[PDB]
C-alpha cells in the first residue's frame, strides 16, 4: 500500500521513469577528477586521484595501475544518522563499484600506480551505488584517465509485483527486489549486476533489461556532462 497507483508511483512517476538526474563534472580542486550527481534525492560526489604513486610500494602491480574505490555515506545522508566510518554495506558497495569501474579502465597504461576513487553520498534515497558509479565514471573521464567506455549504472526493481525502473528509498525499502546494473553501454558489457530480493528468472531478466535501458539514458546524460565540460574548456 501503495508504491504503484494509478499507474503512477509515489512521486508521481510512471514505472519506466527516471528521477530528475543532474550531473556536473570537475567540482573539486584537489581531486584529479570530480563529478557531482543529483539523482532524485541522492546527492553524491565522486573524486579521483590520480594515477598516483602507490603506497605501500608492495601493493604495486608491475604491469598496471590498481583501482581502489571507497564508497562512504555522510552521517547526515540517511534518515537515521549513520555513525561515521566503514560498514559491511559500504565495504561491499565499494568492492562492487570497483569491479564496475575496473573493466572500463585501461589499467596497464599506468603501471605501479593506484587510481583512487572516492564516492561520497551526501544524501541518499536509494540508488547511491549506481548514481555513484555514474559519477565515478565522469570523475574518471574528468581525471583524463583513458577509458574504454563510461560505465553507466541504474537500478531496476520490483514493487507491487511490478517491475519498475530506478527505485526511491520507499520503493527499495518496501519493494520486492533491487536490481542495480552498471554497464559500459557501447559494447553492452555489464560490469555490475546485483539482485537483492526475490524474483523469478523472467522478472530478474526483465529488471536487468529495464535497468540497462535506464543506464543507457544515464549514459547520454554522462556524455552530455562531458560535452558540457569539453565546451567550458573551449575558452578562449
Amino acid at each position: 500500500k501503495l508504491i504503484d497507483e494509478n499507474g503512477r508511483r509515489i512521486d508521481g512517476r510512471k514505472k519506466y521513469e527516471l528521477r530528475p538526474i543532474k550531473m556536473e563534472v570537475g567540482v573539486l580542486k584537489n581531486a584529479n577528477g570530480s563529478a557531482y550527481i543529483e539523482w532524485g534525492k541522492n546527492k553524491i560526489i565522486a573524486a579521483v586521484y590520480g594515477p598516483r604513486e602507490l603506497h605501500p610500494k608492495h601493493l604495486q602491480r608491475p604491469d598496471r595501475a590498481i583501482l581502489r574505490v571507497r564508497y562512504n555515506m555522510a552521517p547526515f545522508s540517511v534518515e537515521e544518522r549513520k555513525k561515521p566510518g566503514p560498514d559491511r554495506r559500504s565495504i561491499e558497495i565499494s568492492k562492487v563499484i570497483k569491479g564496475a569501474l575496473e573493466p572500463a579502465l585501461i589499467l596497464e597504461m599506468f603501471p605501479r600506480t593506484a587510481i583512487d576513487v572516492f564516492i561520497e553520498v551526501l544524501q541518499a534515497d536509494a540508488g547511491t551505488r549506481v548514481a555513484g558509479i555514474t559519477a565515478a565514471s565522469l570523475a574518471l573521464a574528468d581525471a583524463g584517465i583513458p577509458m574504454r567506455d563510461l560505465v553507466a549504472a541504474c537500478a531496476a526493481g520490483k514493487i507491487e509485483g511490478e517491475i519498475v525502473l530506478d527505485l526511491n528509498k520507499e520503493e527499495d525499502n518496501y519493494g520486492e527486489a533491487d536490481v542495480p546494473v552498471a554497464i559500459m553501454p557501447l559494447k553492452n558489457d555489464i560490469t555490475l549486476l546485483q539482485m537483492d530480493g526475490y524474483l523469478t528468472k523472467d522478472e530478474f531478466i526483465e529488471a536487468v533489461k529495464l535497468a540497462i535501458k535506464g543506464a543507457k539514458a544515464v549514459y547520454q546524460k554522462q556524455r552530455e556532462a562531458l560535452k558540457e565540460k569539453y565546451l567550458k574548456i573551449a575558452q578562449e
Binding site: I91, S94, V96, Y198
Partner: protein, 267 residues
C-alpha cells in the same frame, strides 16, 4: 602463475578445464552436517579442496526495534589466515564481507530461515541465529562452498524449544530441541568468466585467471534470492541469462546433496 592464465584460456578453447571438469561441472562435493556437535547446527562443505565449516549458534535476544515481529539472523564469514596465504588476520576484509552479505541475502531474501517463526515474545524476545562461517581451505568458489554449508547447517540446526510461560512471564529454554523454520534451500551457483566462456565452480587456479564472476542464488521454488557479479570483468546480458538458468540446474543438483547430507545426520 600468469603463465597459468595462458594454459587455462588455451585449454578452455578446447572445451577443457585443467582438471577435466566440463564447464558446467562442480568439483566433487562433500557435505557433512552436525560435525560441530556443540553448535546448534553445522556443516562441513568441501567443493573439491575448498573447505568451509559453518556453525549455527542460536541464542535469545531482543529483535531490532524496526522488526519486533522477526527473529535475528546474522552471517559472518571468517577467512581464517590458515585457509589461504591470501587470508590475513583481522576484521573481515571486503572478500569476507561480500561473501557474508551475499550468502545472507540469499537466505534472508528467500525467507529460507523464516524469521517470523522465530519470535517468542513479540518485540521483546526472539531467536537470534548466528551463521558463522569458518573458511578452512580456500581453493576456489568460496561463495558456493559457504552458501551450501550455511543452508545445510541451518537445515541441520536443532535449537532448544523455548516457551513463554504466559503465567510468570518467564521464558523457559527446554531440553527438547526443534528445527529452525527453514523453509527453502537457497544454493548459490557461481560462474567465472574466462575470456568468453563461463565455467561453473571456478577453482583457485581459475579464479586467478578469470575476468569476472557471477553468482546466482536460487531456491526450489524457481526463485532467485541473490545475484552478485563480483570482481571485475563484464558479462553480456545473455551470459547472465545462461548463468541464471544453469545456476537453477546446478542448484537442484546440489540441493539434493544438501538434503541427503541433512537426512544422513539424523541416522
Amino acid at each position: 602463475a600468469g603463465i597459468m592464465r595462458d594454459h587455462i584460456i588455451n585449454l578452455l578453447k578446447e572445451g577443457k578445464r585443467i582438471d577435466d571438469r566440463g564447464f558446467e561441472d562442480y568439483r566433487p562435493i562433500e557435505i557433512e552436517v552436525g560435525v560441530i556437535e556443540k553448535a546448534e547446527g553445522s556443516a562441513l562443505v568441501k567443493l573439491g579442496s575448498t573447505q568451509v565449516l559453518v556453525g549455527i549458534k542460536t541464542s535469545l535476544g531482543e529483535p531490532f526495534p524496526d522488526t519486533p515481529n522477526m527473529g535475528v539472523m546474522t552471517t559472518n564469514v571468517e577467512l581464517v589466515p590458515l585457509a589461504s596465504p591470501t587470508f590475513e588476520p583481522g576484521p573481515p576484509d571486503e572478500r569476507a564481507i561480500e561473501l557474508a552479505r551475499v550468502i545472507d541475502r540469499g537466505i534472508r531474501e528467500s525467507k529460507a530461515l523464516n524469521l517470523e517463526k522465530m519470535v517468542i515474545v513479540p518485540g521483546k524476545i526472539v531467536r537470534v541465529v548466528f551463521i558463522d562461517v569458518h573458511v578452512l581451505d580456500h581453493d576456489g568458489n568460496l561463495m558456493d562452498a559457504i552458501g551450501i554449508a550455511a543452508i545445510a547447517a541451518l537445515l541441520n540446526a536443532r535449537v532448544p524449544k523455548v516457551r513463554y510461560n504466559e503465567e510468570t512471564g518467564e521464558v523457559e529454554t527446554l531440553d527438547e530441541t526443534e528445527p529452525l523454520p527453514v523453509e527453502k534451500i537457497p544454493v548459490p551457483v557461481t560462474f567465472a568468466k574466462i575470456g568468453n566462456i563461463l565455467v561453473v565452480d571456478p577453482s583457485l587456479d581459475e579464479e586467478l585467471v578469470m575476468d569476472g564472476k557471477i553468482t546466482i542464488t536460487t531456491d526450489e521454488t524457481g526463485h532467485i534470492s541473490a545475484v552478485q557479479k563480483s570482481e571485475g570483468g563484464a558479462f553480456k546480458l545473455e551470459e547472465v541469462m545462461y548463468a541464471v538458468e544453469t545456476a537453477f540446474k546446478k542448484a537442484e543438483e546440489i540441493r539434493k546433496l544438501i538434503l541427503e547430507a541433512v537426512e544422513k545426520a539424523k541416522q
